[PDB]
Design a protein around this ligand. Structure first.
Ligand code: NI
Ligand code: NI
Ligand code: NI
Ligand code: NI
Lengths: 115, 82, 115, 82
């Protein structure tokens, strides 16, 4: 528990929450298109063509990208939170395509469900 | 290692719990430069999603995650670290 | 020109751009629901009930609010850019309802059209 | 009056002009703490909208608006001041 959680049943509640959202994604109509996720990306701020490729990829997915918020971290690094909505397949496709771009140093998905 | 780092806290919360978002905001304002910004999607009548971008050493980031994630009405609060 | 624009035809280009987006909003099918706008709001960070009311108002408009990005300016002030998509009427209704909340100090609309 | 202020620069630009967004990003990174964050909506196949939140005195804010608004491929660039 000591990054230091506060008590006994505090690390476990946090686990049941992302267990329950993770069980949601597994057994829910593969083809349900309202699921939403956050893709967190850190990338080289001056990799030729990288930003344009990421834009192109997001625009070709269209309806599946709600917005992106970008932080200029420093001279070398940008962080983006890209908010996605679609089925599991469309969301994983997008994560993988952005993850496989030269200059992307980090591309991690957080799955979010409605309650 | 007491190094400043960026992190994203993803929260889903009940769009109707009174005082919840006022509490979330008080915490973030009282944290000053450790919150960079928040983005919010109104997912449906009962749920809001926020991505809250944070900046600090891992102990400061942790204290923030605890404080926001422990609020009544918060259904999900998961942290991603640089 | 001196906030200081650079030359002669530089202040005027900037005027033709928001003339042309402003002429767009005036004579385009009142009922076209794809128009998008940015509502910029500055508000009292600790006005009882203000944030909840703003959320309620945005959730009741639903599909018409794409996202909001919030900056905690200081102890007393928050800024938000609320991105809206709808017809002119839905967008103006929303601006007015947020503008008439106790604690909102500033609520200005920027209309954005596709080219 | 040489006071730091917040401002929002709303930009619409061509989602296909090569080098445009790399230029926009270079300017913002080279401006350091005068850019707080950007939010981007992919409006359609040919247009992106960004809200770029800035911080600085009115001369610094102006220099930024000029630099970003003058880029080829930028179709609209309008500033809102606190
Ligand atoms: Ni950047
Ligand atoms: Ni909401
Ligand atoms: Ni705030
Ligand atoms: Ni775009």
């Amino acid at each position: 528990i000591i990054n230091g959680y506060s008590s006994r049943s505090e690390l476990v509640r946090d686990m049941i929450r992302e267990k329950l959202v993770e069980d949601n994604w597994a057994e829910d109509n593969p083809n349900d298109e309202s699921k939403i996720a956050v893709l967190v990306v850190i990338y080289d701020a001056h990799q030729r063509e990288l930003n344009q490729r990421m834009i192109d990829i997001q625009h070709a997915s269209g309806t599946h990208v709600l917005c992106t918020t970008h932080i200029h971290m420093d001279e070398h690094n940008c962080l983006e939170t890209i908010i996605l909505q679609g089925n599991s397949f469309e969301i994983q496709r997008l994560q993988l395509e952005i993850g496989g771009l030269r200059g992307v140093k980090f591309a991690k998905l957080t799955k979010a469900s409605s309650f």
